[PDB]
């Protein structure tokens, strides 16, 4: 089974994907997480991707498509989390899959209003050395665990990221909907309620 998680930044896609991957046996492919590892390591990909990410822009399609080709699991269930982000990426993903006799089975759209988005991203905190994700209000970090606020989670960059999402990524909603595999999630609910919804659509 192959799932795509789609939705605005801050919708809770990474949170749900980690939980679903651990509980139900999916390989979790986070382009954000893989890109951030590339950046800390200073690989050619990391060095190039870094400037787009800082400005809240999407990293060029060709880099992302090559990345997915490089990391795509040979067997097993997969959650693509934050990929595809563009129509070209979605077309490339369908093409890779077809040559493997595979296909995207469900696309889950994590619907949440912009105001909720802004609140979630503004309050997002990360353990920089483990990657674990927190929220200063909805899931606070215990005292004496060091957390940072990601630089792209600043108000100006959030604004840009949301604009980018609506322009380039939102068209994927209609792209997948016309394949008949789109399922809607109310991602504005608390974590446990969102997770219940996730299990429902894929069951």
Per-residue DSSP letter, 99: T
Which residues ranging from 72 to 101 are in contact with ligand ADP (CB under 6 A)?
82-83, 85, 89
166 is catalytic: no
Residue spans of alpha helices (H) in the chain: 13-24, 31-41, 44-54, 61-71, 87-98, 114-122, 155-164, 171-177, 191-202
150 is catalytic: yes
| Segment near ligand ADP (CB under 6 A); pick from 39-47, 54-62, 100-108, 141-149 | 54-62
| Three-state SS at 70 | helix
85 is catalytic: yes
Total residues contacting ligand ADP by CB under 6 A comes to: 33
Backbone φ and ψ of 76, nearest 5°: 100, 175
Burial-class residue 83 by CB neighbours within 10 Å (0-12, 13-18, 19+). Answer: buried
Nearer to ligand ADP by Cβ, of 17 and 101: the residue is 17
Positions that interact with ligand ADP (CB under 6 A): 9-15, 31-32, 35, 52-53, 56-59, 64, 82-83, 85, 89, 120, 123-124, 133-135, 138-139, 161, 190-191, 194
What residues act catalytically?
Answer: 13, 85, 124, 150, 161
Residue positions forming the annotated binding site for AMP = 31, 57-59, 82-85, 89, 161
């Amino acid at each position: 089974m192959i799932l795509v998680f789609l939705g605005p930044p801050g919708a809770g896609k990474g949170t749900q994907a980690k939980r679903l991957a651990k509980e139900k046996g999916f390989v979790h492919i986070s382009t954000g997480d893989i890109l951030r590892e590339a950046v800390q390591k200073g690989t050619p990909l990391g060095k190039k991707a870094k400037e787009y990410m800082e400005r809240g822009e999407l990293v060029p399609d060709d880099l992302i498509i090559a990345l997915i080709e490089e990391v795509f699991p040979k067997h097993g269930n997969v959650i693509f989390d934050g990929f595809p982000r563009t129509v070209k990426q979605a077309e490339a993903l369908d093409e890779m899959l077809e040559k493997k006799g595979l296909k995207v089975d469900h696309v889950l759209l994590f619907e949440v209003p912009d105001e909720v988005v802004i609140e979630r991203l503004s309050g997002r905190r990360i353990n920089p050395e483990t990657g674990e994700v927190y929220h200063v209000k909805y899931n606070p970090p215990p005292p004496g665990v060091k957390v940072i606020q990601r630089e792209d989670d600043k108000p100006e960059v959030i604004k840009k990221r949301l604009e980018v999402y609506r322009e380039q990524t939102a068209p994927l909603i209609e792209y997948y909907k016309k394949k008949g595999i789109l399922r809607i999630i109310d991602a504005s609910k608390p974590v446990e309620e969102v997770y219940r919804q996730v299990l429902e659509v894929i069951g």
